[PDB]
Amino acid sequence: MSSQVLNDIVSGSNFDHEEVDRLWKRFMKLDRDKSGTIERDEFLSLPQVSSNPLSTRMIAIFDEDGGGDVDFQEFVSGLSAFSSKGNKEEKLRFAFKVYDIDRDGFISNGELFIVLKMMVGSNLKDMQLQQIVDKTIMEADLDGDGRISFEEFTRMVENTDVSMSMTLDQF
Amino acid sequence: LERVCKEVQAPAFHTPTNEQFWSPVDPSKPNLAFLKQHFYREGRLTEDQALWIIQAGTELLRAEPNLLEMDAPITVCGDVHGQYYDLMKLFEVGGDPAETRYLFLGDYVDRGYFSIECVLYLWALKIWYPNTLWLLRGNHECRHLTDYFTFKLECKHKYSEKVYDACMESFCALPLAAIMNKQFLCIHGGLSPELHTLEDIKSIDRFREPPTHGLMCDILWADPLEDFGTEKTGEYFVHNNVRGCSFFFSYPAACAFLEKNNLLSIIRAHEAQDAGYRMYQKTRTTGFPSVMTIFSAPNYLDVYNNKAAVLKYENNVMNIRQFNCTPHPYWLPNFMDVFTWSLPFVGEKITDMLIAILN
Amino acid sequence: GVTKKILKEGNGVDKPVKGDDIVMNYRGCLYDSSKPSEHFMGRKFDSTEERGEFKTKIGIGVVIRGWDEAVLQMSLGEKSILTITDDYAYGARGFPGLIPPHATLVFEVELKGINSKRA
Ligand SMILES: C=CC[C@@H]1/C=C(\C)C[C@H](C)C[C@H](OC)[C@H]2O[C@@](O)(C(=O)C(=O)N3CCCC[C@H]3C(=O)O[C@H](/C(C)=C/[C@@H]3CC[C@@H](O)[C@H](OC)C3)[C@H](C)[C@@H](O)CC1=O)[C@H](C)C[C@@H]2OC
Ligand SMILES: [Ca+2]
Ligand SMILES: [Ca+2]
Ligand SMILES: [Ca+2]
Ligand SMILES: [Ca+2]
Ligand SMILES: [Fe+3]
Ligand SMILES: [Zn+2]
């Protein structure tokens, strides 16, 4: 259905040609129906994925254009932020995108509640979770628009090693 | 969404303008009604607003004697420990301070995560009602305990170390005791082997951190014996192994003090009570309880499910008013924001899926 | 890595296994050597008293290692102290703002539930 230039995927990412060749093999393992794209069900058919509270966030982040499936360029770009060769900013950007459900570049009150609730379940009552979301926004929202920009996010998490969290040792 | 839980009241997200902060009735004082609801909504002051309140309170407190003397009627209150939402209930049941005399026995801060709201609102009340509301020092109003527990962290999170330091200086100005209605010694903690007459309180240099030993320590730290009133040994004082400092004092010690100083009872706080109060053995001489403990923090620590109480003394009746806890907003441990809280787990979840995909 | 001192035995029959949902009350404190008789529990950093009961899958590595191993050795209703050295908790990294680098943790725990069962 499509074409792509492997050298451009290489130069546009943190990966070298050998790594991208290996990534193509992993992509084919995922692409069970050999369509050339990873459909939602092809992610969710992995038990380690369907049982993970952030599965729908990771799928959505991979699907850069929001078109409903993941092509090889999107697969490589999504993984590139986790390279040990990657920088501090792109790892913070990936973390920001976990919370920014509608991809508009700001975390809203409701987005932050929804994503946190995915992970905490009934460990917090809705009122409790809403209260600490509200106060985090109150503290992070320096320009007063009720939402959290990428710059406001990075300021809040200065003392967290987000780079360590957002790296994979082996590709 | 824009918001998921619409029925949950949002906090006050902005600091008051100076126009909002100052009272329209008396522009030299803060707007109390405004402050009361602002803190109820988890709102913050500006640093300059907070420093003004703390410093204005310090100027009033430092002019007061070590030993206050005031008549009844009055509402006497024990520990509050930062439980602002219960402090609101305390005033509902104890009387509006616009028309009610108050005496607090200390421990305004620590454990509860609304300690700075308790201090700023009580200090604002002191500024409005300097001749009808009084504040004593508790053992928590000092640097050592506020650093060990939560108040220093709370001030640094919500305000600044400068605000914390201003509170510490204000706490050094808090009076240490009161004689209430020429009848009751009111202190936070307890008697002392060095507390012979009331002149001993007056001689203290209170404007300093409490020492680890000595009369000033004991006033803030001492407890009645566990078997107060049914002792076997004749000792007046024994080392307090529960606190690790100061003393337990006995019923005979309390009777001796009261008789020597022509007082009826010691009213104190400092120990949590399931009922919010405890009355100890009556004296032979007058038949008043020799000691009363009053404790005003209900469901203390979110743990004990105890009642709180205040004492309302008027027309020669000691009215005991208990109240139960009120719900309060939730904070993560150490005031942590939800990104700091969640990001470690977020990292684990994401990389667990990438590993599954790649391996 | 972790030691478990029993304070009240549970029912001695229902024990969590890998993959079970467990329900736990706890108080977690920093280790303080000056406090034997408080089980070396110093300053509290968290507890369920102030929030609500704690729920997690057990034995699959989504909580710290000391919990993941010790909880499999509890029975329903058991109340115990877990003393966990840093390499079975948060290690060098600690937890920013809450758990210092290389901290030994002490938890008082009570196993309230395993899947549908309640103590
Ligand atoms: C979106 C929210 C995040 C999500 C939070 C919740 C479901 C709320 C739940 C009540 C946690 C508490 O929230 C108030 C708070 O509990 C502590 O105070 C605590 O008492 C503690 O030590 N516990 C909790 C009880 C089980 C043992 C241990 C834990 O293993 O906790 C786990 C933990 C932090 C594991 C890390 C994960 C990162 C790895 O790198 C690290 O590897 C070393 C181990 C928790 C249960 C995670 O499974 C789930 C989450 O993290 C932590 C000190 C900080 C923690 O907040 C994060
Ligand atoms: Ca496919
Ligand atoms: Ca796509
Ligand atoms: Ca958004
Ligand atoms: Ca903003
Ligand atoms: Fe106290
Ligand atoms: Zn006290």
Numbering used by the authors:
A (entry chain B): 1 to 171
B (entry chain A): 30 to 388
C (entry chain C): 11 to 129
Task: Provide excerpts from the study.
Calcineurin (CN) is a Ca2+/calmodulin (CaM)-dependent, serine, threonine-specific protein phosphatase that controls T-cell activation and is critical for numerous cellular functions. The CN complex is composed of a catalytic (CnA) and regulatory (CnB) subunit that binds Ca2+, and is activated by Ca2+–CaM2. Here we report the crystal structures of fungal CN ternary complexes with FKBP12-FK506 from highly clinically relevant human fungal pathogens: A. fumigatus, C. albicans, C. neoformans, and Coccidioides immitis, reflecting the common invasive fungal pathogens, including a mold, yeasts, and a dimorphic endemic fungus. Each complex has three components: (1) the CnA subunit with catalytic domain and the BBH, (2) the CnB subunit, with four EF hands bound to Ca2+ and wrapping around the BBH, and (3) FKBP12 bound to FK506, interfacing with CnA/CnB.
Crystal structures of CN–FK506-FKBP12 ternary complexes from four fungi were determined by molecular replacement to resolutions between 1.85 and 3.30 Å. Despite sequence variations between the mammalian and fungal counterparts of CN and FKBP12, the X-ray characterized ternary complexes reveal high structural homology. A flexible hinge in CnA separates the catalytic domain from the BBH, which forms the composite surface for FKBP12-FK506-complex binding. Fungal CnB structures are also conserved, with two well-resolved C-terminal EF-hands close to the FKBP12-FK506 binding surface and the two distal N-terminal EF-hands showing varying degrees of disorder, suggesting interaction with FKBP12-FK506 may stabilize the C-terminal EF-hands. The interface between CN and FKBP12-FK506 complexes is conserved across fungi, but differences are notable in the binding surfaces of FKBP12 and CnA in fungi versus mammalian proteins. While the CnA and CnB interacting residues within 5–8 Å of FK506 in human and fungi are conserved, fungal FKBP12s differed in 4 of the 17 interacting residues, as well as other residues surrounding the 40s and 80s loops.
